[PDB]
Amino acid sequence: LPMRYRKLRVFSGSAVPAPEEESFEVWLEQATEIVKEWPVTEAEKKRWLAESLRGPALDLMHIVQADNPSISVEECLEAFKQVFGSLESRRTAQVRYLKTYQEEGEKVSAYVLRLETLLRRAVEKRAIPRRIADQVRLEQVMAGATLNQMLWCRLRELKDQGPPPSFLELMKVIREEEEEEAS
Amino acid sequence: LPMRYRKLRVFSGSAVPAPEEESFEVWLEQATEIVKEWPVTEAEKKRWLAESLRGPALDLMHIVQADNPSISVEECLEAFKQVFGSLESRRTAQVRYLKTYQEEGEKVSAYVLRLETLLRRAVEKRAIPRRIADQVRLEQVMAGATLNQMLWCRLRELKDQGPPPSFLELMKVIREEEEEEAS
Amino acid sequence: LPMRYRKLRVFSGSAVPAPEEESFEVWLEQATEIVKEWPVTEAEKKRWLAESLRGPALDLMHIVQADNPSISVEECLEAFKQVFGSLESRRTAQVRYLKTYQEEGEKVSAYVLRLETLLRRAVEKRAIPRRIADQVRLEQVMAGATLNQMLWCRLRELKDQGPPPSFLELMKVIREEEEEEAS
Amino acid sequence: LPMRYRKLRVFSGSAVPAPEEESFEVWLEQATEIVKEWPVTEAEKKRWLAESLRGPALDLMHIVQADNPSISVEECLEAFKQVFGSLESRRTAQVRYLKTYQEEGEKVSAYVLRLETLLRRAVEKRAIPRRIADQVRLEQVMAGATLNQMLWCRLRELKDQGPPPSFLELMKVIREEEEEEAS
Amino acid sequence: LPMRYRKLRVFSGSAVPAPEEESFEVWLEQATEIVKEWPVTEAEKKRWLAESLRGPALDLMHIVQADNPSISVEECLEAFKQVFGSLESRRTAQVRYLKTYQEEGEKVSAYVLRLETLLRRAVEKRAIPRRIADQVRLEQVMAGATLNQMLWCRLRELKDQGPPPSFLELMKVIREEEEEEAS
């Protein structure tokens, strides 16, 4: 049998959130689900929507409704996106990707996962053409990582051995090299 | 399917509450819902009402009932408002609004949201006429904020370009100016 | 729809309880409800009763049952009252009331609520006649509080203007005087 | 209506448990209930049984099953008792009782409850004959407690006034003497 | 009646997890159950699967789906095993077992349980033949433990008295020797 009901994800909109809160992009997934999918009455949608909000973000929702009583939940979410959503230039998406380097004590397979989230944003905002993202991924790994020289021998084969690797192919080759023998 | 049942909001009435408690004005929303809407028996209403109370506030509820056994939940909430509700002069509503200035490291869009809660109280208590609240909002932002001079050029257009802006219009113009370019 | 099920109130019987526990007089309300009202089987009553106990208090319940297998839940609660309940002389109820004075930084309306719990105990235990409790309340407020002199002018009217005030009447007159004007 | 479902009691088997865990003798009550009483399918019994285990204790359960696939839950609990249960000589039960004295700031009624748990273990393990446990209780209270001399006058009546008192009789006489008068 | 629904086990994939998280080998049991057994719709499986993930591990799941929309839950778990699963040579399994010695203040029955988890891994990965695991267990206990000399007399009988003992037989003989007499 399906286990315990799952708690709502949550969001404050604060300049420094609590470590249990989500990104706006993820709270907006839960909110889009509640709006589009749930078989529920409007005031019960609105009480489930309201129950997820904290911080400053809870405080906007009342102001917007009082000034327009005809507001649907589909319209109220459009006001919520303007105040708490995100604005970022093409140049900022591009510069924020290319500046990313491996940290102290971070593993190479941890770095290559962290770096892949930034490459998707830069391809959405048309900063990088989708035609060349697999070449741009390999060039940035060899630029930013602290590769051991047996790993260096393999990545230099992938650079030359036909087309550039996919994400899961590159991630496999890295994992085979990360393992150490005990003493 | 609708997710986990939602916890009751809570209130102590203490001089310093726990950071999880609500304002009396919000606990009184939950209490007004339980009183007016829920399809429930009186002793079960009263056990749900009681379950939300803590601090000193829990302690009043017994005293009031013993001295009048005929008391309805509609009458018991009227006694609760007298002891824990709020009293504020017209002059205090007006002075408490006009004294409000931007804090250290606070953003201009955070300040303009914080300031809008105070303008609604002052218009309820008839301190500010509802006829002029959109003019009074722009005059207080230019008085209290630490505007950069490219933002200053735009707000001085809004001051002259016909009628004064609404809340969401002003909030849009501010957000377009707050964003910075990376290096 | 009625919201989430409510957690059991709890009791340790310890010399210093955790701050989440209740007075014995309140845990005994929940226990009296479970005994008298719930439509449940005996071993399920006894498992709900048991689930609320902690500290030393949990440890008594087994000893009492082993020595008398015929024990009903109505009889087992009578043993529980003897060991954890309260004993207090008429003279201690009277002296513990009359010694009560306003604390550092406590408000007058907070003091007059705190003092009313003690006057009910002293009238149950026949230390104070129920005929005169409204006179005894006003005499103790003027004895124990740190009244400002505009409040002093009003309470000295109530002392002379016919019969002494009720609890909610006195509490109204105090609240009208507690409010301050901003600068 | 019966209130919220009750959380499982829990057990680690560790040399120092968390303060929320039970004695093995109490986790084994919950486990005996799940085994004998619940109207449930075997793999769902085994998933409820498993869900209560932590620490080292969780880790044994897998090893035992792999080496004998025909194992019933009635047989698997017999292996669990051998590794985490308790072994104690007749002489250790007797010596551990007789050495028990009142602590700093402990009340006499708290001591006489704490001491009664130890007398039951010593009568199970046949160290003390059940024929004489009420005499042995009074002799140990007068040996171990720090009695005031008005309490001393009453316990010396109980020693001589026919048969020795029961547990609840002795506990009543002690409670009547513990109370103090205010000043 | 079966008690409260049980919380999901959880996993971050982080280099240092929170102390409430499981090993990947145990989160993968819960995930294999959800995939194979639960009578549920695909998007509700995927929302239950997703709800258990945190840390870096939550972040992989989106990337994999976007690059192949035809992916089943049976295929998505195969990608999850490659990135977060475990790689270990035959020589590392063997060396990691044989190096294991008793710690400061650890009991002999606690050591012999801790050591048995390592012997199962080394027999899965074909480092130790299953034909001889009961001999290899006794040789490692006499090598690694700090045995008292009355325990030494008994284990030297088991070494010679026909076939080597099973796990529960050896664990019984150790437990009979660990107990001490009070003073």
Side-chain angles (χ1 to χ4, degrees), chain C residues 44-67:
Chain C
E44 186 176 345
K45 283 188 180 178
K46 289 170 63 178
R47 282 169 183 167
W48 281 119
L49 215 54
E51 168 66 12
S52 180
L53 294 174
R54 257 299 184 99
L58 179 55
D59 313 335
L60 171 66
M61 192 88 185
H62 284 139
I63 296 155
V64 176
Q65 287 170 355
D67 297 347

PDB file of all heavy atoms in Angstrom, chain C residues 44-67:
ATOM      1  N   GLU C  44      -8.426  -1.189  23.834  1.00  0.00           N
ATOM      2  CA  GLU C  44      -8.109  -0.029  23.007  1.00  0.00           C
ATOM      3  C   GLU C  44      -8.224   1.304  23.760  1.00  0.00           C
ATOM      4  O   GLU C  44      -7.383   2.188  23.535  1.00  0.00           O
ATOM      5  CB  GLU C  44      -8.925  -0.065  21.706  1.00  0.00           C
ATOM      6  CG  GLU C  44      -8.557   1.047  20.693  1.00  0.00           C
ATOM      7  CD  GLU C  44      -9.288   0.954  19.359  1.00  0.00           C
ATOM      8  OE1 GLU C  44      -9.871  -0.109  19.055  1.00  0.00           O
ATOM      9  OE2 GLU C  44      -9.279   1.960  18.616  1.00  0.00           O
ATOM     10  N   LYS C  45      -9.204   1.442  24.680  1.00  0.00           N
ATOM     11  CA  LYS C  45      -9.163   2.520  25.683  1.00  0.00           C
ATOM     12  C   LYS C  45      -7.838   2.491  26.442  1.00  0.00           C
ATOM     13  O   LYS C  45      -7.155   3.519  26.521  1.00  0.00           O
ATOM     14  CB  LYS C  45     -10.317   2.435  26.694  1.00  0.00           C
ATOM     15  CG  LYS C  45     -11.701   2.897  26.231  1.00  0.00           C
ATOM     16  CD  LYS C  45     -12.691   2.943  27.404  1.00  0.00           C
ATOM     17  CE  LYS C  45     -14.064   3.414  26.944  1.00  0.00           C
ATOM     18  NZ  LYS C  45     -15.067   3.433  28.047  1.00  0.00           N
ATOM     19  N   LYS C  46      -7.489   1.340  27.020  1.00  0.00           N
ATOM     20  CA  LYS C  46      -6.298   1.174  27.848  1.00  0.00           C
ATOM     21  C   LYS C  46      -4.993   1.432  27.072  1.00  0.00           C
ATOM     22  O   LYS C  46      -4.061   2.027  27.631  1.00  0.00           O
ATOM     23  CB  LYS C  46      -6.325  -0.218  28.486  1.00  0.00           C
ATOM     24  CG  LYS C  46      -7.413  -0.266  29.545  1.00  0.00           C
ATOM     25  CD  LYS C  46      -7.742  -1.626  30.118  1.00  0.00           C
ATOM     26  CE  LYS C  46      -6.567  -2.220  30.849  1.00  0.00           C
ATOM     27  NZ  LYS C  46      -6.913  -3.535  31.454  1.00  0.00           N
ATOM     28  N   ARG C  47      -4.946   1.109  25.772  1.00  0.00           N
ATOM     29  CA  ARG C  47      -3.793   1.452  24.930  1.00  0.00           C
ATOM     30  C   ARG C  47      -3.731   2.945  24.546  1.00  0.00           C
ATOM     31  O   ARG C  47      -2.628   3.515  24.522  1.00  0.00           O
ATOM     32  CB  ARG C  47      -3.762   0.547  23.685  1.00  0.00           C
ATOM     33  CG  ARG C  47      -3.208  -0.869  23.989  1.00  0.00           C
ATOM     34  CD  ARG C  47      -3.376  -1.917  22.880  1.00  0.00           C
ATOM     35  NE  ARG C  47      -2.867  -3.208  23.329  1.00  0.00           N
ATOM     36  CZ  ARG C  47      -3.086  -4.366  22.716  1.00  0.00           C
ATOM     37  NH1 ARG C  47      -3.795  -4.447  21.614  1.00  0.00           N
ATOM     38  NH2 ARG C  47      -2.578  -5.482  23.229  1.00  0.00           N
ATOM     39  N   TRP C  48      -4.876   3.626  24.449  1.00  0.00           N
ATOM     40  CA  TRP C  48      -4.908   5.087  24.263  1.00  0.00           C
ATOM     41  C   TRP C  48      -4.562   5.844  25.545  1.00  0.00           C
ATOM     42  O   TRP C  48      -3.906   6.890  25.490  1.00  0.00           O
ATOM     43  CB  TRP C  48      -6.272   5.556  23.757  1.00  0.00           C
ATOM     44  CG  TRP C  48      -6.537   5.358  22.296  1.00  0.00           C
ATOM     45  CD1 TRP C  48      -7.531   4.611  21.743  1.00  0.00           C
ATOM     46  CD2 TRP C  48      -5.899   6.028  21.224  1.00  0.00           C
ATOM     47  NE1 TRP C  48      -7.491   4.696  20.385  1.00  0.00           N
ATOM     48  CE2 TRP C  48      -6.509   5.571  20.040  1.00  0.00           C
ATOM     49  CE3 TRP C  48      -4.848   6.946  21.134  1.00  0.00           C
ATOM     50  CZ2 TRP C  48      -6.111   5.989  18.799  1.00  0.00           C
ATOM     51  CZ3 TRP C  48      -4.454   7.358  19.894  1.00  0.00           C
ATOM     52  CH2 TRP C  48      -5.094   6.863  18.744  1.00  0.00           C
ATOM     53  N   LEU C  49      -5.029   5.346  26.686  1.00  0.00           N
ATOM     54  CA  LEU C  49      -4.726   5.894  28.006  1.00  0.00           C
ATOM     55  C   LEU C  49      -3.221   5.799  28.271  1.00  0.00           C
ATOM     56  O   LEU C  49      -2.569   6.819  28.536  1.00  0.00           O
ATOM     57  CB  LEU C  49      -5.568   5.180  29.069  1.00  0.00           C
ATOM     58  CG  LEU C  49      -6.080   5.970  30.279  1.00  0.00           C
ATOM     59  CD1 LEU C  49      -6.841   7.199  29.827  1.00  0.00           C
ATOM     60  CD2 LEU C  49      -7.020   5.082  31.059  1.00  0.00           C
ATOM     61  N   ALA C  50      -2.670   4.577  28.180  1.00  0.00           N
ATOM     62  CA  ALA C  50      -1.235   4.278  28.288  1.00  0.00           C
ATOM     63  C   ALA C  50      -0.349   5.148  27.375  1.00  0.00           C
ATOM     64  O   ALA C  50       0.675   5.667  27.838  1.00  0.00           O
ATOM     65  CB  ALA C  50      -0.994   2.798  27.994  1.00  0.00           C
ATOM     66  N   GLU C  51      -0.711   5.315  26.089  1.00  0.00           N
ATOM     67  CA  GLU C  51       0.051   6.121  25.118  1.00  0.00           C
ATOM     68  C   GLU C  51       0.254   7.603  25.528  1.00  0.00           C
ATOM     69  O   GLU C  51       1.245   8.216  25.108  1.00  0.00           O
ATOM     70  CB  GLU C  51      -0.659   5.996  23.746  1.00  0.00           C
ATOM     71  CG  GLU C  51      -0.273   6.940  22.587  1.00  0.00           C
ATOM     72  CD  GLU C  51       1.141   6.745  22.056  1.00  0.00           C
ATOM     73  OE1 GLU C  51       1.806   5.741  22.388  1.00  0.00           O
ATOM     74  OE2 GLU C  51       1.613   7.647  21.334  1.00  0.00           O
ATOM     75  N   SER C  52      -0.548   8.152  26.431  1.00  0.00           N
ATOM     76  CA  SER C  52      -0.395   9.540  26.847  1.00  0.00           C
ATOM     77  C   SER C  52       0.613   9.732  27.998  1.00  0.00           C
ATOM     78  O   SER C  52       1.099  10.856  28.186  1.00  0.00           O
ATOM     79  CB  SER C  52      -1.780  10.083  27.237  1.00  0.00           C
ATOM     80  OG  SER C  52      -1.748  11.429  27.662  1.00  0.00           O
ATOM     81  N   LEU C  53       0.918   8.679  28.774  1.00  0.00           N
ATOM     82  CA  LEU C  53       1.762   8.707  29.978  1.00  0.00           C
ATOM     83  C   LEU C  53       3.267   8.729  29.658  1.00  0.00           C
ATOM     84  O   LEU C  53       3.725   7.978  28.789  1.00  0.00           O
ATOM     85  CB  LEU C  53       1.447   7.454  30.798  1.00  0.00           C
ATOM     86  CG  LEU C  53       0.039   7.366  31.379  1.00  0.00           C
ATOM     87  CD1 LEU C  53      -0.202   6.025  32.040  1.00  0.00           C
ATOM     88  CD2 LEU C  53      -0.021   8.439  32.389  1.00  0.00           C
ATOM     89  N   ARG C  54       4.059   9.545  30.377  1.00  0.00           N
ATOM     90  CA  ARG C  54       5.542   9.394  30.373  1.00  0.00           C
ATOM     91  C   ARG C  54       6.105   9.604  31.793  1.00  0.00           C
ATOM     92  O   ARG C  54       5.362   9.620  32.778  1.00  0.00           O
ATOM     93  CB  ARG C  54       6.158  10.302  29.303  1.00  0.00           C
ATOM     94  CG  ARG C  54       6.572   9.509  28.026  1.00  0.00           C
ATOM     95  CD  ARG C  54       7.638   8.435  28.298  1.00  0.00           C
ATOM     96  NE  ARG C  54       8.101   7.756  27.092  1.00  0.00           N
ATOM     97  CZ  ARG C  54       9.209   8.020  26.414  1.00  0.00           C
ATOM     98  NH1 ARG C  54       9.995   9.025  26.728  1.00  0.00           N
ATOM     99  NH2 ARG C  54       9.533   7.256  25.374  1.00  0.00           N
ATOM    100  N   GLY C  55       7.437   9.729  31.895  1.00  0.00           N
ATOM    101  CA  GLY C  55       8.155   9.961  33.141  1.00  0.00           C
ATOM    102  C   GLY C  55       8.018   8.843  34.167  1.00  0.00           C
ATOM    103  O   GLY C  55       7.977   7.662  33.807  1.00  0.00           O
ATOM    104  N   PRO C  56       7.974   9.182  35.457  1.00  0.00           N
ATOM    105  CA  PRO C  56       7.492   8.213  36.462  1.00  0.00           C
ATOM    106  C   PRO C  56       6.049   7.745  36.301  1.00  0.00           C
ATOM    107  O   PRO C  56       5.739   6.638  36.769  1.00  0.00           O
ATOM    108  CB  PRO C  56       7.706   8.938  37.812  1.00  0.00           C
ATOM    109  CG  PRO C  56       7.720  10.378  37.509  1.00  0.00           C
ATOM    110  CD  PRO C  56       8.408  10.420  36.114  1.00  0.00           C
ATOM    111  N   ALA C  57       5.158   8.568  35.741  1.00  0.00           N
ATOM    112  CA  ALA C  57       3.715   8.317  35.729  1.00  0.00           C
ATOM    113  C   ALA C  57       3.339   7.066  34.938  1.00  0.00           C
ATOM    114  O   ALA C  57       2.420   6.334  35.322  1.00  0.00           O
ATOM    115  CB  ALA C  57       2.965   9.520  35.161  1.00  0.00           C
ATOM    116  N   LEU C  58       4.061   6.809  33.842  1.00  0.00           N
ATOM    117  CA  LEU C  58       3.934   5.603  33.035  1.00  0.00           C
ATOM    118  C   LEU C  58       4.187   4.297  33.809  1.00  0.00           C
ATOM    119  O   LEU C  58       3.643   3.250  33.435  1.00  0.00           O
ATOM    120  CB  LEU C  58       4.890   5.741  31.847  1.00  0.00           C
ATOM    121  CG  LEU C  58       5.063   4.680  30.771  1.00  0.00           C
ATOM    122  CD1 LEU C  58       3.717   4.366  30.166  1.00  0.00           C
ATOM    123  CD2 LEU C  58       6.001   5.247  29.742  1.00  0.00           C
ATOM    124  N   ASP C  59       4.970   4.342  34.883  1.00  0.00           N
ATOM    125  CA  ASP C  59       5.554   3.212  35.591  1.00  0.00           C
ATOM    126  C   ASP C  59       4.626   2.631  36.675  1.00  0.00           C
ATOM    127  O   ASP C  59       4.641   1.418  36.910  1.00  0.00           O
ATOM    128  CB  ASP C  59       6.887   3.622  36.244  1.00  0.00           C
ATOM    129  CG  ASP C  59       7.801   4.396  35.296  1.00  0.00           C
ATOM    130  OD1 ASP C  59       7.698   4.244  34.070  1.00  0.00           O
ATOM    131  OD2 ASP C  59       8.649   5.162  35.810  1.00  0.00           O
ATOM    132  N   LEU C  60       3.798   3.479  37.297  1.00  0.00           N
ATOM    133  CA  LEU C  60       2.744   3.104  38.257  1.00  0.00           C
ATOM    134  C   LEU C  60       1.657   2.168  37.688  1.00  0.00           C
ATOM    135  O   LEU C  60       1.165   1.261  38.414  1.00  0.00           O
ATOM    136  CB  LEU C  60       2.120   4.393  38.792  1.00  0.00           C
ATOM    137  CG  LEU C  60       0.862   4.340  39.658  1.00  0.00           C
ATOM    138  CD1 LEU C  60       1.184   3.655  40.957  1.00  0.00           C
ATOM    139  CD2 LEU C  60       0.332   5.737  39.921  1.00  0.00           C
ATOM    140  N   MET C  61       1.230   2.419  36.439  1.00  0.00           N
ATOM    141  CA  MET C  61       0.050   1.830  35.800  1.00  0.00           C
ATOM    142  C   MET C  61       0.118   0.291  35.755  1.00  0.00           C
ATOM    143  O   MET C  61      -0.883  -0.386  36.035  1.00  0.00           O
ATOM    144  CB  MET C  61      -0.092   2.423  34.389  1.00  0.00           C
ATOM    145  CG  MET C  61      -1.407   2.164  33.651  1.00  0.00           C
ATOM    146  SD  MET C  61      -2.746   3.333  33.937  1.00  0.00           S
ATOM    147  CE  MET C  61      -4.034   2.524  33.003  1.00  0.00           C
ATOM    148  N   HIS C  62       1.291  -0.270  35.450  1.00  0.00           N
ATOM    149  CA  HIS C  62       1.522  -1.721  35.473  1.00  0.00           C
ATOM    150  C   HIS C  62       1.409  -2.364  36.862  1.00  0.00           C
ATOM    151  O   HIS C  62       0.783  -3.446  36.987  1.00  0.00           O
ATOM    152  CB  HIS C  62       2.896  -2.032  34.882  1.00  0.00           C
ATOM    153  CG  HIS C  62       2.948  -1.949  33.402  1.00  0.00           C
ATOM    154  ND1 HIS C  62       3.997  -1.404  32.713  1.00  0.00           N
ATOM    155  CD2 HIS C  62       2.122  -2.443  32.462  1.00  0.00           C
ATOM    156  CE1 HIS C  62       3.793  -1.497  31.417  1.00  0.00           C
ATOM    157  NE2 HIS C  62       2.656  -2.139  31.235  1.00  0.00           N
ATOM    158  N   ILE C  63       2.052  -1.759  37.885  1.00  0.00           N
ATOM    159  CA  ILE C  63       2.044  -2.272  39.261  1.00  0.00           C
ATOM    160  C   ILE C  63       0.607  -2.441  39.750  1.00  0.00           C
ATOM    161  O   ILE C  63       0.255  -3.490  40.315  1.00  0.00           O
ATOM    162  CB  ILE C  63       2.831  -1.334  40.198  1.00  0.00           C
ATOM    163  CG1 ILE C  63       4.320  -1.257  39.847  1.00  0.00           C
ATOM    164  CG2 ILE C  63       2.720  -1.776  41.657  1.00  0.00           C
ATOM    165  CD1 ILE C  63       4.978   0.042  40.309  1.00  0.00           C
ATOM    166  N   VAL C  64      -0.239  -1.430  39.513  1.00  0.00           N
ATOM    167  CA  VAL C  64      -1.607  -1.418  40.054  1.00  0.00           C
ATOM    168  C   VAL C  64      -2.474  -2.542  39.454  1.00  0.00           C
ATOM    169  O   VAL C  64      -3.216  -3.229  40.175  1.00  0.00           O
ATOM    170  CB  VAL C  64      -2.244  -0.036  39.843  1.00  0.00           C
ATOM    171  CG1 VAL C  64      -3.690  -0.005  40.303  1.00  0.00           C
ATOM    172  CG2 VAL C  64      -1.462   0.991  40.617  1.00  0.00           C
ATOM    173  N   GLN C  65      -2.333  -2.789  38.149  1.00  0.00           N
ATOM    174  CA  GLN C  65      -3.099  -3.815  37.438  1.00  0.00           C
ATOM    175  C   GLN C  65      -2.723  -5.237  37.860  1.00  0.00           C
ATOM    176  O   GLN C  65      -3.620  -6.080  38.020  1.00  0.00           O
ATOM    177  CB  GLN C  65      -2.915  -3.650  35.931  1.00  0.00           C
ATOM    178  CG  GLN C  65      -3.649  -2.440  35.374  1.00  0.00           C
ATOM    179  CD  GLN C  65      -3.288  -2.107  33.931  1.00  0.00           C
ATOM    180  OE1 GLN C  65      -2.407  -2.731  33.340  1.00  0.00           O
ATOM    181  NE2 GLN C  65      -3.967  -1.110  33.378  1.00  0.00           N
ATOM    182  N   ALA C  66      -1.413  -5.531  37.993  1.00  0.00           N
ATOM    183  CA  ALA C  66      -0.945  -6.872  38.387  1.00  0.00           C
ATOM    184  C   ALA C  66      -1.512  -7.350  39.730  1.00  0.00           C
ATOM    185  O   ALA C  66      -1.851  -8.531  39.885  1.00  0.00           O
ATOM    186  CB  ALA C  66       0.576  -6.904  38.427  1.00  0.00           C
ATOM    187  N   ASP C  67      -1.639  -6.453  40.697  1.00  0.00           N
ATOM    188  CA  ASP C  67      -2.146  -6.768  42.025  1.00  0.00           C
ATOM    189  C   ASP C  67      -3.675  -6.884  42.085  1.00  0.00           C
ATOM    190  O   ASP C  67      -4.191  -7.311  43.121  1.00  0.00           O
ATOM    191  CB  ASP C  67      -1.646  -5.728  43.045  1.00  0.00           C
ATOM    192  CG  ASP C  67      -0.120  -5.735  43.201  1.00  0.00           C
ATOM    193  OD1 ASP C  67       0.537  -6.679  42.722  1.00  0.00           O
ATOM    194  OD2 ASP C  67       0.423  -4.790  43.824  1.00  0.00           O
TER     195      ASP C  67
END
